[PDB]
Paper text:
A 13-member family of ABA receptors PYR/PYL/RCAR (PYLs) in Arabidopsis thaliana was genetically and biochemically identified. Upon binding (+)-ABA, dimeric PYLs underwent a pronounced conformational rearrangement, and then bound and inhibited the group A protein phosphatases type 2Cs (PP2C), including ABI1, ABI2, HAB1 and PP2CA. PYLs/PP2C heterodimer blocked substrates binding to PP2Cs, and thus released downstream transcription factors SnRK2 kinases formerly inhibited by PP2C. Structural analysis along with biochemical data in vitro demonstrated that steric hindrance and hydrophobic interaction in the pocket of PYLs were crucial for their stereospecificity to ABA enantiomers.
The complex of PYL9 with (+)-ABA was solved at 2.68 Å resolution. Each asymmetric unit contained a symmetric cis-dimer. One protomer had four α-helices and seven β-sheets, sharing the similar arrangements of other known PYLs. Loops L4 and L5 played the role of the gate and the latch respectively, which locked the (+)-ABA in a conserved pocket. The (+)-ABA was encaged in the cavity by abundant hydrophobic interactions, several hydrogen bonds and two salt bridges. Surprisingly, a disulphide bond between C34 and C159 was observed in PYL9-(+)-ABA structure. On the other hand, the pocket ingeniously arranged a bigger room to accommodate the 8′, 9′ dimethyl of (+)-ABA, for example, the bulky residue I112 of PYL9 was involved in direct binding 8′ methyl group of (+)-ABA, respectively. However, due to the confinement of 9′ methyl group by the coordination of several bulk residues on the entrance of the pocket of PYLs, the 7′ and 8′ methyl groups of (−)-ABA were uncomfortable with the bulk side chains, such as I112 and L165 of PYL9, which make (−)-ABA incompatible in the pocket for the strong steric constraints. By contrast, PYL9 did not inhibit PP2C activity at 10 µM or even higher concentration of (−)-ABA.
Author numbering:
A (entry chain B): 18 to 134, 137 to 184
B (entry chain A): 18 to 135, 137 to 184
Write the structure that this text describes.
């Protein structure tokens, strides 16, 4: 699309991979945005987050500590809010630490209005270091699986709330 | 495609999910098929297999025990050759055991000739698998799909590399 080139086509280092995922949601922008924007409450649509803690009211620079469910190669992740534009509908996160295999993970999510035939298009893209011993493809296929899980869930939650009002 | 309706559109139990993946490879069919069909040698293109054991010459009904690399929610898998048609280029596998979370995994893979830019081959692999208690259909299928993309991409890489050399 037009938007992929604007925010989502990333230049990454040799030891890195990058990808972008698109999701269409039969819900209005305001529902979808007010779910993704909530930095201290990803567990509301992210299926693998069991717990999330943020000290103070969230602002740019804030850290969150997220605990993930059993069955994953990770138990905790520490994440920083890099960008949050309520007017342009842009969210930037960088994972800065924790239990897991994702070093230098950086993320940008954008939300856009679309066609009922009101809908919403969510694009999330990332960059991440390839762990020693894995390939670019392996790393990016796995991370994409996580993101698909998130955006599909975000879709379901959003469309559920839309049907109620 | 029109092929996915023939071999790859599966009906599911409620507790199951199903999906199909396509890969185009810039290599001739003979190379791709030779790799895919070697039931006792999946580690030749499957990047997560560290070891494979098949007792006796592989026939229909044969079992393989695959050992898997560290870093996965699995160490071993035991798998059965359900179907191998060397003329139609069809392979069917069923995962019957191991210490992993894929109960009742069934797999079908077909290979088809294509015209590459100037030659090429299209690989379709689809599966059915139980949703583990506590996961959703989406989670289950998105994860298994990650594994299959890894395998088919590697298959593409190995195939095209071999095609370079003649
Ligand atoms: C579910 C999970 C699995 C891991 O192995 C790493 C980590 C714990 C960071 C993670 O929460 C990853 C989450 C990702 C990639 C995106 C997100 O949630 O926006
Ligand atoms: C790589 C891996 C990870 C697991 O969690 C289960 C298992 C060990 C079965 C597996 O080998 C799965 C392989 C799959 C789904 C298809 C294949 O390779 O044809």
């Amino acid at each position: 699309v037009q938007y992929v080139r604007t925010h989502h086509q990333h230049l990454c280092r040799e030891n890195q991979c990058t990808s972008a995922l698109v999701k269409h949601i039969k819900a209005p922008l305001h529902l979808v945005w007010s779910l993704v924007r909530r930095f201290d409450q990803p567990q509301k649509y992210k299926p693998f987050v069991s717990r999330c803690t943020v000290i103070g009211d969230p602002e740019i620079g804030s850290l969150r500590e997220v605990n993930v469910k059993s069955g994953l190669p990770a138990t905790t992740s520490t994440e920083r809010l890099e960008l949050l534009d309520d007017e342009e509908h842009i969210l930037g996160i960088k994972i800065i630490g924790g239990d897991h295999r994702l070093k230098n993970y950086s993320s940008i999510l954008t939300v856009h209005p679309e066609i009922i035939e009101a809908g919403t298009m969510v694009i999330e893209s990332f960059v991440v270091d390839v762990p020693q011993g894995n390939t670019k493809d392996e790393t990016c296929y796995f991370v994409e699986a996580l993101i698909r899980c998130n955006l599909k869930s975000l879709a379901d939650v959003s469309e559920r709330l839309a049907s109620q009002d």
